[PDB]
Design a protein around this nucleic acid. Structure first.
Ligand code: ZN
Ligand code: ZN
Lengths: 365, 163, 365, 163
DNA sequence: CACGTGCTAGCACGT
DNA sequence: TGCGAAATTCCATGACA
DNA sequence: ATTGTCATGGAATTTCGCA
DNA sequence: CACGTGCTAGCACGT
DNA sequence: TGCGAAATTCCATGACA
DNA sequence: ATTGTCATGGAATTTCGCA
């Protein structure tokens, strides 16, 4: 009872005056429209907000109502929120009510072999004792190569990619941080050939979206063809590879084969509208097409989005949380804002990490 | 007729036997008629069975209107006949003993045949492992006749690995 | 070449006239802005649309472009779409581009014990050799009872519910079609006590939303309390049950305990604003609160939603599709439209089934 | 003082021994002071240990301000003392030998004590299994004094199982 | 014993 | 009355299956 | 024969203290 | 050998 | 020209992880 | 150090055949 001059009519900032503050049972009380509540000293208040909150680690409004059941003080929610900010369990357990920043729509690779996009589909039904598939999608064209493997290992990855790069060598190759892509052994092979390795932020397949989205088309057509018949898929990849590379994307009105070559091969329903033009007048028109291709823009930001600012406190989704364990790591600081969807954090272990904002929540308070 | 285009004719032929590099005694050679683009496939025998296995890889990428070859056994089977038709490729052969492709191909089948041999007793029984690099230079070799390289002609772009 | 009078200037409906239709190579051709295309006879057309489509079972526009590469005929897309309609593989493999009807917001149970909502949380970390929890949520109030079990079996379910119904007997009890709730043995017990069993449509937990949404709060607070300490959760359920039943929902400004009793028990921060009123003046005010409680309404329907009409052809999401198998069962007919989100279908096996439209797609064409 | 409310006082007491129905020899009895609402717990002994185990179930639902009982061993332990305080329940006892609750409770502790015995040598050693039904009627028995039943008083609604 | 409904396990790779 | 500050309420986001 | 739900914390909105 | 990243297995219940 | 029909394009929905 | 993507099929919109 230190700022107690209220009984003596003294005006202390933040305390409305029209209310009479009496004493009773050794507690300063105040008759409010709510009822009569007890005003605890500024020293006790933290201990009470803590006591109340820890009942079910209730959020702001929930924690307040409990408190209001008995007490009144100036600007209750401020003392409340201050604690929610210092509660390690709620901070790391409570989900976020902010959604991510709107997606980037990376510009699409300028020419063939500019960026490759690679992945590993499977395991799948053992067909010819092969369990996996290495998908290789050219960024610019969407041309796709499908290599059956027995394991998602550096071995087969290099083994396929060598065969693939007997055709051409690509500037950069993008992929998830999957076991065999992060391998030093692969890092070698990559560097031997002066190929730049790019890696998607961890636990964020959107970033290997081009492969992944082809992963659908592959898996979908593979399915349509194994209807009412065993899942022997090995002997169908080539069929699928051709079928798919030669399948028109309605937005662009071009097949991935077309954007790579400019001219249809000896495939069915083969298009011959450039049969007149000499190969130069053909190839020329191609660089004209490859430039004016449709490109989607960033969609509108959610009304309740959030954007990574340097130094802001954020937390990283726990990769594989156990049963009944928090889903958020302790809070970390933003070092670099690579872009509105990518962030270098001071990882909890305690490293530098490049993460998608999709695996972050901003720390509340 | 109408202008020469890629995929119009794939000229094929074998090269072998060679020293047993990793167990591969021959090499099936595919060249594009128009771009001169070249595909190399180490096979253990110049057989339809090993040839099909290889042109089955190639035809999952592109399909030529016509495969043109010599009358070597591998290329004139019934098997290779039936294989061609199923895919809609027309088969065409040089008349036996007196071969004939085009200038572009004639030179390339040379380029390869010499580009191979520098690697023969220059690099012992270790040529299999470098077969892809042979291919790469082969496809990035500036053409005097046409101002461009095969890789530029086929894909329409500078290559990232030029020679 | 049957409707061939075009070479003879005759006008056949659907064929623009400004175009000259010549012959060449035994095929009727037509010079178009596109180029020169071949007109196949009305008999051949199906065979061609089929041939084209089956290349990668491409959808409408994708399948057409292939076709347009060589041919022209009146209203191509019609012959195209007709086949997509008769292709058993695409019909059952292709995902849907219509989203469901907007959700219902069921009126909330009028009084306590009107509807119970029950579920089985777990398996979980063996604590005291108990692996599961039976959650029982009163609909009207949100009062919750938590019974630890060793199995999600009729045994423990009845065993708990007997204990629970020593307090009161509920009119109806709702639950997912989980093993132990569909049991005849449970059906008995239920009927013995003249309790009506209700069951959520299959593979649709939204329908047991009240339990499920309490399933969160339970699991979340259970987690906040096992931070940096073993996952022994048995000895914490009671604690959690009290803590939660007595935790204010900010929308309603009431604890589930309050809506059940009208008066706080001897729990911390206990609210005493009705200490003046006699129990009648207390209980009376309660029926007044329980009526004016906030209730959410149906949100807006998506611009591309779809609504179950009787007799319309729809398909049921394959419960657990294998790897590389179609996700849709063959198409079935709507018999009863229970409501804009619930449908009796002629199940594929071939039964009557009550399904959520959330596990249906309307059959395209 | 201020009006009688539910949870204000839980009057407890044992009833036993009884015939060993399924192994349960006693019954811990809890009645609400204001609604007369009654909770019945078969226990194997009238001990604090078995009593705590039972009021631990009850107190996960509601908590009374005061538990009022007789001076029976079970209720006057140090254990039961410490248990009460940890939960903030005030303990209160009748003065020994001359018990005292209220009219409502006095009658209910009777109602139960008789409602039990019809089930005694009316239904042999099979009373455990019907203990919940005893409870249900008990809580749906129309009160003359107060116009309502406990289930109506406590919950504020008609019950679906009225007697 | 396989099926249906409800649930969470688990394994591969390279470091 | 009207103003500035404080308290309330709104609400889309995400997690429960 | 059935039907989504609600704690959450910045942002918006409404109410309060004082003239 | 456990950890990280990438993946899909699998088990319980009652009929 | 302007009309009605046909062809095109738009696009949110869902699946790939 | 990095970044979502595109086939899909009713609905809307733009173009075409013919005056
Ligand atoms: Zn907390
Ligand atoms: Zn199809």
């Amino acid at each position: 009872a230190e700022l107690d001059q209220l009984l003596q009519g003294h005006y202390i900032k933040g305390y409305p005056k029209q209310y009479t503050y009496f004493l009773e049972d050794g507690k300063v009380k105040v008759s409010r429209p709510e009822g009569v509540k007890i005003i605890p000293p500024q020293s006790d208040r933290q201990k009470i907000v803590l006591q109340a909150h820890n009942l079910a680690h209730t959020g702001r409004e929930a924690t307040l109502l409990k408190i209001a059941n008995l007490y009144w003080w100036p600007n209750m929610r401020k003392d409340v929120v201050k604690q929610l900010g210092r509660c390690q369990q709620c901070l790391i357990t409570n989900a976020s009510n902010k959604a991510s920043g709107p997606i980037l729509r990376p510009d699409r690779p300028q020419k063939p072999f500019d960026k490759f996009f690679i992945d590993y589909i499977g395991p799948l039904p053992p067909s010819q004792g092969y369990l996996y598939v290495l998908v290789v999608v050219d960024g610019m064209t969407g041309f796709t190569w499908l290599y059956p493997t027995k394991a998602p290992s550096t071995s087969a990855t290099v083994k396929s990619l060598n065969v693939l790069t007997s055709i051409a060598i690509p500037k950069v190759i993008h992929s998830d941080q999957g076991a065999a892509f992060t391998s030093s052994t692969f890092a070698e092979w990559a560097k031997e050939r002066g190929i730049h390795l790019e890696f998607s932020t961890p636990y964020h397949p959107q970033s290997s979206g081009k492969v992944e989205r082809k992963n659908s088309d592959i898996k979908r057509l593979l399915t349509k063809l194994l209807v009412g018949r065993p899942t022997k898929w090995y002997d169908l990849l080539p069929v699928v590879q051709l079928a798919l590379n030669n399948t028109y994307s309605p937005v662009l009105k071009y097949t991935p084969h077309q954007l790579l070559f400019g001219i249809d091969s000896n495939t069915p329903f083969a298009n011959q509208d450039t049969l007149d033009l000499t190969r130069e007048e053909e190839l020329s028109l191609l660089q004209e097409i490859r430039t004016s291709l449709y490109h989607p823009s960033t969609p509108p930001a959610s009304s309740r989005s959030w954007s990574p600012v340097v130094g802001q406190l954020v937390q990283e989704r726990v990769a594989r949380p156990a049963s009944l364990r928090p889903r958020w790591h302790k809070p970390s600081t933003v070092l670099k804002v690579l872009n509105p969807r990518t962030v270098v954090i001071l990882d909890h272990l305690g490293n530098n990490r490049t993460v998608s904002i999709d695996n972050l929540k901003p720390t509340s308070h | 007729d109408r202008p020469q285009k890629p995929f119009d004719k794939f000229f094929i032929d074998y090269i072998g036997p060679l020293p047993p590099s990793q167990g591969y005694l021959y090499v099936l050679v595919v060249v594009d008629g128009m771009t001169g683009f070249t595909w190399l496939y180490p096979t253990k025998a110049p057989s339809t069975s090993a040839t099909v296995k290889s042109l089955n890889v190639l035809t999952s990428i592109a399909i030529p209107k016509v495969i043109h070859s010599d009358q070597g056994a591998a290329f004139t089977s019934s098997t290779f006949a039936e294989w061609a038709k199923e895919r809609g490729i027309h088969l065409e052969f040089s008349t036996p003993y007196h071969p004939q492709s085009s200038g572009k191909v004639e030179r390339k089948n040379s380029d390869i045949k010499r580009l191979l041999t520098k690697l023969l007793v220059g690099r012992p029984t270790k040529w299999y492992d470098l077969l892809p690099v042979v291919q790469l230079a082969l496809n990035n070799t500036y053409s005097p006749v046409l101002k461009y390289t095969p890789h530029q002609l086929l894909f329409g772009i500078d290559s990232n690995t030029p020679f």
